[PDB]
């Protein structure tokens, strides 16, 4: 069945393909070539796992199509889902709801997980009888007990309309009641059931259990929850506005106290900002200070620009980043692919897309990709597969590649054809 997630541009990548010594293996876990860059990404991944040093910034820089985002996806896959990995595009911070600095702060705080443990003492059981002073009788498969009821407790039992046969949980620390459902029985079967009705088995073991529960949240979620009375709604709608510095400072201090008490754990993650050259000078200046915080995640960036104009200024800088921020980060450089690496990337893409191709087809597709671009060849893989299926074939041949090459143009051929008829296109 077609699940929500389908074959995308990075579906074949399932990690960095490194060994225990971080030596890059050729054609491992979907990664081909980029040996030096993959080794550097492994070193950065070890830094992220260690977590000791906050605010380390890494810029993955290279030519278009050299696997920068592929390396980022490999890092995200190799890193466990427990550790946060916030992947955004540079253009996601330009919002009408909040300033750019607020958006970068929220991206920073979303990339730091905090794991909070909590112990509670609850009484869970099936209600046998309730008498309106008051008395309540509960039972499990192993025990039966009767309690005396206070004024607030009898009020809570009445308001929730707890009836005999229900399964309820009452927290001794707070005295609140929650109805988990009603136990099914010979007499409680009905022709229609209410929306809230849930059938549940009688609880096992002892009534008064001691719980240990661990909640995994992030600093941004804590900020939003503490932003206003119904702040957790903004965890859905995103209408968080600009969270005040008071709330953030009080949360940083409370989390520090929690970690000192052993209640919470901090899991520093990664903030990947692809296409980082969309950030403006204000964003870069904010990042220069934001990375100096001890609650800063490890920052990874990707760009393909050369000596280009910094957005928001008239200055030109390498990678479109001012040298203040470039001095604060390490640069990993990608390398253009060889013929062998191109062919192996095409083979892995065919294996993911479930396409069978003849060897001559592999040679011609590799030549096309070397001459035009790797992405164009990847697209022509599925194009030729479709054209072959329309032909009632079972293996993609060179003729199908020539067919799709004639049907779908690349940038160069399309540009040449546009220039040939430039009198018809607008605003040349």
């Amino acid at each position: 069945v077609t699940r929500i997630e389908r074959i995308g541009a990075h579906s074949h990548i399932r990690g960095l393909g490194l060994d225990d010594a971080l030596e890059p293996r050729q054609a491992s876990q979907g990664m081909v070539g980029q040996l030096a860059a993959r080794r550097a990404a492994g070193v950065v991944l070890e830094m992220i796992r260690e977590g000791k040093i906050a605010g380390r910034a890494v810029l993955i820089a290279g030519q278009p199509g050299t696997g920068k985002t592929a390396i980022a996806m490999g890092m995200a896959q190799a890193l466990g889902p427990d550790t946060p990995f916030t992947a955004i595009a540079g253009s996601e911070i330009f919002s009408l709801e909040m300033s750019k600095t607020e958006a970068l702060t929220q991206a920073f705080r979303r990339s730091i997980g905090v794991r909070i443990k909590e112990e509670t003492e609850i009484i869970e059981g099936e209600v046998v009888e309730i008498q309106i002073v008051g008395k309540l009788t509960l039972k499990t498969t192993e025990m039966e007990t009767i309690y005396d009821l206070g004024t607030k407790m009898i009020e809570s039992l009445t308001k929730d309309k707890v009836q005999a046969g229900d399964v309820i949980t009452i927290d001794k620390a707070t005295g609140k009641i929650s109805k988990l459902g009603r136990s099914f029985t010979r007499a409680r079967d009905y022709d229609a059931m209410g929306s809230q009705t849930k059938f549940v088995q009688c609880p096992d073991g002892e009534l008064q259990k001691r719980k240990e529960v661990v909640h995994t949240v992030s600093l941004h979620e804590i900020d939003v929850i503490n932003s206003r009375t119904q702040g957790f709604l903004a965890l859905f709608s995103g209408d968080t506005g600009e969270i005040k510095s008071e709330v953030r400072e009080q949360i940083n201090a409370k989390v520090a106290e929690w970690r000192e008490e052993g209640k919470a754990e901090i899991i520093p993650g990664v903030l990947f900002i692809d296409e980082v050259h969309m950030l403006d000078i204000e964003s870069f200046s904010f990042l220069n200070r934001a990375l100096e915080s001890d609650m800063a995640p490890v920052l990874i960036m990707a760009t393909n620009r050369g000596i280009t104009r910094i957005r928001g200024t008239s200055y030109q800088s390498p990678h479109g980043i001012p040298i203040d921020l470039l001095d604060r980060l390490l640069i990993v450089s990608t390398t253009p692919y060889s013929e062998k690496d191109t062919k192996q990337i095409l083979r892995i893409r065919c294996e993911e897309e479930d396409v069978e191709m003849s060897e001559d087809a592999y040679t011609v597709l590799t030549r096309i990709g070397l001459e035009t671009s790797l992405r164009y060849a990847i697209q022509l893989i599925t194009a030729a597969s479709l054209v072959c299926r329309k032909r009632k074939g079972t293996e993609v041949q060179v003729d199908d590649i020539k067919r799709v090459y004639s049907l779908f143009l690349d940038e160069s051929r399309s540009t040449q054809y546009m220039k040939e008829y430039q009198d018809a296109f607008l605003f040349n």
Binding site: T197, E275, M278, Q379, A383, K390, F427
Partner: protein
């Protein structure tokens, strides 16, 4: 429909079984290579295997780029989602451009949800709370006695359900709706402010397997803000100004997980569709740079772009010129289908099809004259002259368009080139 639109004649791509474009079929004339490419694109979309692959329709104005996108939409069908948008629609004043693009991406993913509705419907003959609730429903096929969960009694009281009223009860959700009074009591009073509804015809218990198509964006906006809540804050939220909001990535991920769970259960089916972004040259550099990641996603649909610009400056950038007004980086992520200028014969065939679609009878001489005019100015101008020419023909008491009417209309209305020449003088 009833009103003739600029593409009402386009009913498909006109391909044969071998995937080759017929010269004139399904309202499309010429553009053989582009129709065959759009055929391969339709096969890609129907495959439901790939995500986030993108296509750029390139060529001069009036070369059928939008017509071809609508032909793809026709070939897919109504079940497959097809979200059209224009590049200038990203400049919302309520949400960021990337949010508008993400919303349109989610709209193009459909989710067909399959369910059996069970409903008990009939006239109420008895309502006695005992615990449990006993209700008696009557229909044209008989009377049935039902035992209801006591939680439905509150719903029955809220709906003010009494004996003799026609109501329905959902077996899965217990929702009760009082759909008026039974028409048998229409004579109980001569003047009552009540809505009488006929007694249901079928059985009291009705079963129907149904399907509903929803988009992931619909789930996103349903979970964006609480609805139907009886709490005072929910009532105020019902009252407040509805605004688009920058729905968070975490909610989208959770919705994806739940949809995946229900796809695994078998009660939902994914229907990936197409997002059509016309005039993609209008997007700014920020939108294109976000679209890089958006297309690289594994949840994205097939996105069809259309650009008519030449080597123009990318918007939101000073003097950086890229082909089609699209950065080369995004161009490397798309497949380019080239549309060509029409030959005079193809323009004549298009004019004929447009006239036939508008219901206009045109003589051979008028058709030849219109073809000559279109050759001299534009196809769209010749095609637009058909309706006024028919109007003048009907005013002159004629059911067919002659060359005199086309001459008169082309004298009354100028083309863009003629106005430009006049204003140059």
């Amino acid at each position: 429909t009833q009103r003739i639109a600029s593409h009402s004649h386009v009913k498909g791509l006109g391909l044969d079984e071998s995937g080759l474009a017929k010269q004139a079929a399904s309202g499309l004339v010429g553009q053989e290579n582009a129709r065959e490419a759009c055929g391969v694109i339709v096969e890609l979309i129907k495959s439901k295997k790939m995500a986030g692959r993108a296509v750029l329709l390139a060529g001069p104005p009036g070369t059928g780029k939008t017509a071809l996108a609508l032909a793809i939409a026709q070939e897919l069908g109504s079940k497959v989602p097809f979200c059209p948008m224009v590049g200038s629609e990203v400049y919302s004043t309520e949400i960021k451009k990337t949010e508008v693009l993400m919303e349109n991406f989610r709209r193009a993913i459909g989710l067909r949800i399959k369910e059996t509705k069970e409903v008990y419907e009939g006239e109420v003959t008895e309502l006695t709370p005992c615990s449990h609730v006993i209700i008696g429903l009557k229909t044209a096929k008989g009377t049935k006695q039902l035992k209801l969960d006591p939680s439905i009694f509150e719903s029955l009281q809220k709906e003010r359900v009494e004996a003799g009223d026609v109501i329905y009860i959902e077996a899965n959700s217990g929702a009760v709706k009082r759909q008026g009074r039974c028409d048998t009591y229409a004579t109980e009073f001569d003047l009552e402010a009540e809505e009488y509804v006929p007694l249901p015809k079928g059985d009291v218990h009705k079963k129907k397997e149904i399907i509903q198509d929803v988009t992931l964006h619909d789930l996103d906006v349903a979970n964006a803000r609480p609805q139907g809540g009886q709490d005072i804050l929910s009532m105020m939220g019902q009252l407040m100004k509805p605004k688009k909001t920058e729905i968070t990535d975490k909610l989208r991920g959770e919705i994806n997980k739940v949809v995946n769970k229900y796809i695994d259960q078998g009660i939902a089916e994914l229907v990936p569709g197409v997002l059509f972004v016309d005039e993609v040259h209008m997007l700014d550099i920020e939108c294109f740079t976000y679209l890089h990641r958006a297309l690289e996603s594994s949840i994205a649909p097939i996105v069809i772009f259309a650009s008519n610009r030449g080597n123009c400056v990318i918007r939101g950038t000073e003097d950086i010129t890229s082909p089609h007004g699209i950065p080369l980086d995004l161009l490397d992520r798309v497949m380019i289908i080239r549309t060509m200028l029409y030959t005079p014969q193809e323009m004549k065939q298009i004019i004929k099809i447009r006239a036939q679609t508008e219901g206009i009878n045109i003589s051979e001489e008028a058709l030849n004259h219109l073809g000559e005019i279109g050759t001299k100015t534009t196809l769209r101008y010749s095609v637009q002259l058909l309706t006024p020419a028919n109007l003048l023909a009907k005013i002159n008491g004629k059911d067919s368009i002659e060359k005199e009417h086309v001459e008169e209309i082309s004298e009354l209305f100028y083309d863009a080139k003629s106005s430009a020449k006049i204003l140059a003088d």
